[PDB]
Symmetry: C3
């Protein structure tokens, strides 16, 4: 999975006619049995998932939250598939992840409790990834909007995003940035995904295939950035330790950032 | 307490002549025995509490910090009243809350230690709410201003606000947003309360009855938002699952934000 | 160490010809054996440490990270010196600090794990201070830049900065702000230092002697803040408890901010 591109794509499990397209456009597809599908449509979604299989090495299935009758039906259904990685919505403790063993688990922390227990969830053995959800977050806080007038996330959402990035990285898990619900707001998605790439998120999860090209381009460093990385790496080959390059103190971790941009560009 | 409006108002306990005015203007009155009252005036303040009752169902009393002789004298003064809900300043541990049993406690976290321990404080059995305080926070950090030139809270205060909001919601406690000290700054207050309302705070604490109307208004969504909520919900009942509405991916938690808007207007 | 001014300065240990200049420019000097010095220059740095001593009372030595052969050689080298305070890079647990007993440790938290464990690190018995580092942080997250286009730290870094400030203050440890790598960027350094001084950081670490006067300046409150502090403290000497002053509500912690402004001026 860590070898798949950054362009991951949700597609509702009761929409099998879209599966192959989802697979085609995206790096990894998340087949959704949760919020994407109404309760009356779950069983059909579960039949589709087993009737219309995708490459299980590039497909994750978002099941329902722990302690729900739906999750048990999902697990019963997945029994009849070859999918080994699931996403857990409303992830709220290590126990919720651990009981999914031996499947690989991407924990979607999208509640206060989850936020408070982030590191615990990250540390759990089955965890291979962490994602965060702004909208469920606010909803469970009893709020009404995740962003301010100007489109930026409200503080608590920004806070949780950092918390999840830290928890995931501190335990060597993948970090996935939140979805961008404004389908046509290409510009905002781009800015969001450039920043996500810059701080070390591994994935930006998309909800529409038109988003994928934007995310992929956004995870390629700017031309001026690659130029810089090339320059500082070259200059460092004539240096021992800390030096000044173009007005700034360079040393090990900065050289590490440069290497990372060049790796991302090659990827 | 969950049943009162968002407009809470401090009034120092040594000004019994303002108690009825406060009760009249506010949803809940916080009678203050701590910072609002000089040490030399505390004993008279305590006398005021016993001599000028307010409806104990709409009235909270902020006592002094744990381990202080003042707190001991507050509790014995309080033995002569019907007040069963107290606010604990400088709340720094679960033990400080638990020791106040059997009273209900709103923890005011306004120290670094408090912030480090917020989740533990919120989980404590008597806790029914959490509030944060930016000014003691900065004071205890060794700092000198909680806000930038432009009026925004400095990063650490913004950080603690979110910490407390999450700690409270994670254990189902009321969340109270900090006081706005600039009494004539109606605009700043409104901007604060509007965002507090959006992110799930239940209350904005006020320090002047002129602020209640502002907080009450801010907690009722704008016309534009209510129109949208009506719209999204209406469409939602012809919808089954995730759909697109006005360019936005909509599902479950977005629907929940809309309900919450309408609930807040209804309230 | 809490008695020296806020202008701390890094100097790599491989460059002993600058030791006295740095000791002259700065309040405290951090002699560096880690990232400022290339692996092949380490042994000479160590030689230089023992052979070119500075006032141990105004010098801290940044050694290498826990569990490395380098750190072992560092301590071995320090045995022949009078330096009793060390800076610990990549601080990731209480155990890494505790093993440095009986030396005093400034923990430099600059990884996600460190951040997740900040309070644990802060509480450890040898810790006397905390510092954070944005660039190793970003590097370990798998990111490529600590700052946005406008120079502002990205969120996760801002988030980590507050974590450290809060962790260190919760256990009474010194707090040290991150270095400013853009040597020429006086204005940004000024703006960071000013804000660091406002939220209670004790120190801004510098990486070039030309930065120290900016930092010292930044930590001295502006003439306008000082006149305010004077004004408010004077008015307060005629008041009892909370009072309105120049449109703001004033009580204890506001009065404390004023005292701290005037203390920083006198210092
Ligand atoms: C929101 C949504 C229902 C919009 O559907 P829509 O109205 O058909 O959107 P469009 O009209 O723009 O679709 C255009 C094309 O993109 C395809 N498409 C859109 N979203 C897709 C998706 N999530 N997966 C696969 N294909 C998708 C459509 O099939 C269509 O393809 P086609 O024209 O070649 O036949 C759909 O985008 C979707 O399901 N998004 C994700 C929902 C989800 O999983 N939420 C759960 C977690 S947030
Ligand atoms: C700041 C403060 C001392 C100013 O008092 P002030 O100088 O009288 O200010 P104003 O002149 O504008 O007050 C006007 C009116 O509002 C009333 N008022 C102001 N603050 C009030 C309060 N907190 N509670 C009840 N009434 C209040 C006054 O009674 C006065 O009423 P009146 O005109 O009918 O006589 C006062 O607002 C106050 O005590 N606020 C709360 C402080 C506190 O509790 N701090 C501790 C925690 S933050
Ligand atoms: C980056 C660095 C090598 C720049 O070196 P430089 O190119 O010689 O810098 P300048 O040209 O601006 O030098 C200006 C003067 O200040 C001195 N100076 C610069 N940085 C200094 C430092 N960190 N300590 C002591 N003196 C320093 C120089 O020696 C020079 O003095 P001089 O004229 O008497 O010879 C130097 O700033 C440095 O080593 N900074 C700290 C690096 C470090 O320790 N990083 C680890 C943690 S971030
Ligand atoms: Mg969700
Ligand atoms: Mg206070
Ligand atoms: Mg570093």
């Amino acid at each position: 999975l860590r070898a798949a591109g950054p362009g991951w794509l949700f597609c509702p499990a009761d929409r099998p006619e879209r599966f192959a397209k989802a697979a085609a456009a995206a790096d990894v597809v998340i087949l959704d049995l949760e919020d994407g599908v109404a309760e009356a449509q779950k069983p059909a979604a579960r039949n589709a998932l087993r009737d219309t299989p995708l490459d299980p090495e590039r497909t994750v299935v978002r099941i329902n939250a722990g302690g729900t009758a739906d999750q048990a039906r999902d697990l019963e259904a997945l029994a009849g598939t070859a999918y080994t990685t699931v996403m857990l919505p409303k992830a709220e403790s290590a126990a919720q992840v651990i009981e999914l063993a031996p499947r690989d688990v991407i924990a979607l922390v999208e509640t206060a409790r989850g936020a408070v227990c982030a590191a615990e969830i990250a540390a759990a053995d089955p965890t291979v990834g962490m994602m965060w959800g702004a909208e469920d977050l606010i909803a469970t806080l009893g709020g009404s909007s995740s962003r301010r007038a100007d489109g930026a996330y409200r503080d608590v959402a920004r806070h949780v995003r950092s918390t999840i990035l830290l928890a995931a990285s501190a335990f060597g898990r993948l970090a996935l940035d939140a979805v961008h619900l404004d389908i046509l707001d290409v510009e905002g998605l781009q800015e969001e995904a450039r920043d996500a790439a810059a701080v070390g998120f591994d994935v930006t999860v998309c909800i529409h295939p038109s988003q994928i090209p934007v995310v992929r381009k956004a995870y390629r460093p700017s031309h001026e950035k690659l130029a810089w990385a090339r320059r500082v790496l070259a200059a460092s080959r004539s240096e021992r330790g800390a030096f000044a390059f173009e007005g700034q103190m360079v040393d090990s971790p900065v050289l590490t950032h440069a290497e990372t941009m060049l790796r991302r560009a090659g990827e």
